[PDB]
């Protein structure tokens, strides 16, 4: 379970993303698509080129789902219910791909927020994204 310190570390870090919430989500997706090219097969219909408006919008949706999870961190199964049904039951995303995107989200935060990404906050963010991943793969 996430500790009171994890919850604080997560809210504090995720609260510097700020209005870049959107942009950072996009970057993390791009980083995933280029580093782990198997993931593109879930998005064969998107244009995945750099600067794509579709990656940009989708990046905002992913970032906003994360912020919803941060905002209801004690009730994530309930808050992410629709999205867990979507990814697991409806889209059949391989659970491995959540580890890949989570790593890309950490990379993006480290690239943008060098002050906030201390070892303690890195550990907390890792645990948070793993918690989210668990919820999102719970409905196969």
């Amino acid at each position: 379970v996430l500790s009171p310190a994890d919850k604080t570390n997560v809210k504090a870090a995720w609260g510097k993303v700020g209005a870049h919430a959107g942009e950072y989500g996009a970057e993390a997706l791009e980083r995933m698509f280029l580093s782990f090219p198997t993931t593109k097969t879930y998005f064969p219909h998107f244009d995945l080129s750099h600067g794509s408006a579709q990656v940009k919008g989708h990046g905002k949706k992913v970032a906003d789902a994360l912020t919803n999870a941060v905002a209801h961190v004690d009730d994530m199964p309930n808050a992410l219910s629709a999205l867990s049904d979507l990814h697991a039951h409806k889209l059949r995303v391989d659970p491995v791909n959540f580890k890949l995107l989570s790593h890309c989200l950490l990379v993006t935060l480290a690239a943008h927020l060098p002050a906030e990404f201390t070892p303690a906050v890195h550990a907390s963010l890792d645990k948070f994204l793993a918690s989210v991943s668990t919820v999102l793969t719970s409905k196969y």
Partner: protein, 145 residues
């Protein structure tokens, strides 16, 4: 691992800028902090009792340099990583016989540290080239000779 010339260039260029005395220790250290079961493999290293102790431990820092050392070697011999690394794993008796996943984890933590240090210069294409290498190195170091 087969790297394109652009991938090779992306890796090599940024690798030359790396603080070889610190980055390795930072990566090894965050592994111990983020993934704490890894401390067991470094029983012999002494005080690993808190994020700051980990990050300040001399043998951590020292073994970090070696981590980098091994990455460079991999870079230098990408078509023959098993060649490059058999003596490295064999001099350790059993200590590198752990799940390939923890080498994957260390590789990813190294990536996070290179992002931390290089900020926007650690672009998505540069990350992607690095992921190819950390993947190759992890596999070869897991291989058991």
């Amino acid at each position: 691992v087969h790297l394109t010339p652009e991938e090779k260039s992306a890796v090599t260029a940024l690798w030359g800028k790396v603080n070889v005395d610190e980055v390795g220790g930072e990566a090894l250290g965050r592994l111990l902090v983020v993934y704490p079961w890894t401390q067991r493999f470094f029983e012999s290293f002494g005080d690993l009792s808190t994020p700051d102790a980990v990050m300040g431990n001399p043998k951590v820092k020292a073994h970090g340099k070696k981590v980098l050392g091994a990455f460079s070697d991999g870079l230098a011999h990408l078509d023959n990583l098993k060649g490059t690394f058999a003596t490295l794993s064999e001099l350790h008796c059993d200590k590198l016989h752990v799940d390939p996943e923890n080498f994957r984890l260390l590789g990813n933590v190294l990536v996070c540290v290179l992002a931390h240090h290089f900020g926007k210069e650690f672009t998505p294409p540069v990350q992607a080239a690095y992921q190819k290498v950390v993947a190759g190195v992890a596999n070869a170091l897991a291989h058991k000779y």
